[PDB]
Amino acid sequence: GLSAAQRQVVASTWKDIAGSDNGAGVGKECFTKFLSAHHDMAAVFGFSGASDPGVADLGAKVLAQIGVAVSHLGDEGKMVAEMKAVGVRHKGYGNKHIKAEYFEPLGASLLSAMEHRIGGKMNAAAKDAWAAAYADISGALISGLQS
Ligand code: HEM
């Protein structure tokens, strides 16, 4: 699971990529590749491919969640309180599908995008900490997900 160092290496890489945009250019470029490589979900998000500005609307709003979740990682006292609520919302979306199997990929593929901003600071302890933490952030959302 998350370690004492990874949990810290997470808040150290989120205070640079998000900064003020909170990951605005991290979700629009992350979900974009996901929607494309994943056409079965492109219709679930509400786009016609990886060329719709709507993606930046979801990723930008999704990245923020991970940001608020990066300040807790193991702290599931409140972090899961909001994330768990997201799942309860996804289960009541329009596609009526959503799967945690897609979360991992959308999470791992996200790290490949993070390097875009802190490409000079994204070190091994940074991509491995967010790769293991993304499982707890997106995983905690699977609590209220899947009605
Ligand atoms: C890969 C599986 C996922 C699918 C298919 C999915 C799909 C969606 C869809 C369809 C929407 C709303 C579409 C619209 O804008 O009309 C949405 C919103 C959202 N998703 Fe996801 N999502 C997934 C994973 C995640 C994960 C892992 C997170 C957490 C990091 C997340 C966080 C959010 C947030 C925060 C919103 C917006 C809620 C708000 O209005 O505040 N989603 N998602």
The domains found in the chain, sorted by start residue, are: 1-147 (1.10.490.10)
Method: NMR
Dihedral over alpha carbons 80, 84, 85, 90 (to 10 degrees):
140
Cα 62 to ligand 1 centroid, rounded to whole Å: 6
Angle at alpha carbon of residue 23, lines to 132 and 84, rounded to 5°? 55
**Residue 65 backbone dihedrals phi, psi, to 5 degrees:** -50, -55
Amino acid found at 61: K
Would you say the CB of residue 133 lies under 6 angstroms from ligand 1?
A: no
Residue ID of nearest Cα to ligand 1 atom 4: 98
Which string of b and e fits 108-117 if b means at least 16 CB within 10 Å? bbbbebbeeb
**CA–CA distance, 116 with 109 (Å, rounded to integer):** 12
**CA–CA distance, 107 with 97 (Å, rounded to integer):** 18
Q: Is 90 annotated as a binding residue?
A: yes
Work out which ligand 1 atom sits closest to the CA atom of 54.
Answer: 15
Closest by alpha carbon to 102, among 33, 26, 15? Answer: 33
Cα 64 to ligand 1 centroid, rounded to whole Å: 11
Cα 90 to ligand 1 centroid, rounded to whole Å: 7
**CA–CA distance, 27 with 114 (Å, rounded to integer):** 9
Q: Do 10 and 70 touch, CB atoms closer than 8 A?
A: yes
Residue with token string 């290496």: 9
